[model samples]
Target: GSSGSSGPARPFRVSNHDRSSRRGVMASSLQELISKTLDALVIATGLVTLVLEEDGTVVDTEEFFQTLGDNTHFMILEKGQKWMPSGPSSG
Candidate 1:
């Protein structure tokens, strides 16, 4: 190994495989894949039932890197002219 940079590495937020052991499970991280499929939503919907084993995924994603939780939950960007946290619930 040369005395060069430890080579390039990626963050956890983007890797959905298992990057929890990397950041030492420190501060919370984030990821922004708004327009990308398989990004935030599990299937093809909004405010849908959400889940995050996030705490134990991969550290080799094609996006940001971060550590998360199994926060299994419900989040949707419902159908409409524009996706909103409120969804069709908004008139």
Candidate 2:
């Protein structure tokens, strides 16, 4: 027969509410910052990739702006230019 444990039946309960709350806030803030940074990178890369001509030629600032405007209009017509899908999809 196993002997009964000698320790008290009711052990002290440690409350992790404050620690968990702090961790949650830290994680949320880190995620928010990362998301904003990625968005900025996306916009910058899009501008760089789309605003240039096909012959590896760099456009003037005015020409770049014009091309960006035209691309925006074209996107409206095309309903999202054939960019790669961002997430998992079921075939």
Candidate 3:
């Protein structure tokens, strides 16, 4: 494997609420993150979308993604799917 690059790779934990699946993804940039998620989740690129798990806001630009912290949680959704906040857990 080739080593040494400009941008430092960012680490993130991506989840699919519908399937209850989670995977760790490593990418050097925002675009790379999206590409890996699509394949990782077996979803079509055109139908894929990424949103922040914190506020359910759509992340569409590199600037916004850059502002996010490493190991940030993300909600991956498909066409017609929307992000919803998970309710508090109680016994």
User: Which candidate tops TM-score?
Assistant: 3
**Model 2: residue 73 alpha-carbon error in angstroms:** 12
Candidate 1, residue 58: lDDT: 23
Off by over 4 Å in 1: 1-29, 33-42, 48-51, 54-91
lDDT computed for candidate 3: 0.78
**Model 2 CA deviation exceeding 4 Å by range:** 1-53, 67-69, 72-91
Model 1 local distance difference test score: 0.27
lDDT of 2 by residue, 1-91 (tens): 1344333221111111111111111111222322232343333332222212222222234334323322121010012333221235544
Estimate every model's Cα lDDT from 0 to 1. 0.27, 0.23, 0.78
Clashes of each: 20, 0, 0
Clashes in predicted model 2: 0
Cα misplacement distance, residue 76 of candidate 2 (Å): 22
Please say which candidate is ahead in TM-score: 1 or 3.
3
TM-score of each: 0.19, 0.18, 0.80
TM-score of 1: 0.19
The full ranking of all candidates by lDDT, starting with the best, is 3, 1, 2
Tens digits of per-residue lDDT, candidate 1, 1-91, equal 2233343432222212221211111112222222222443243554322123323222334233333333222122234322123224424
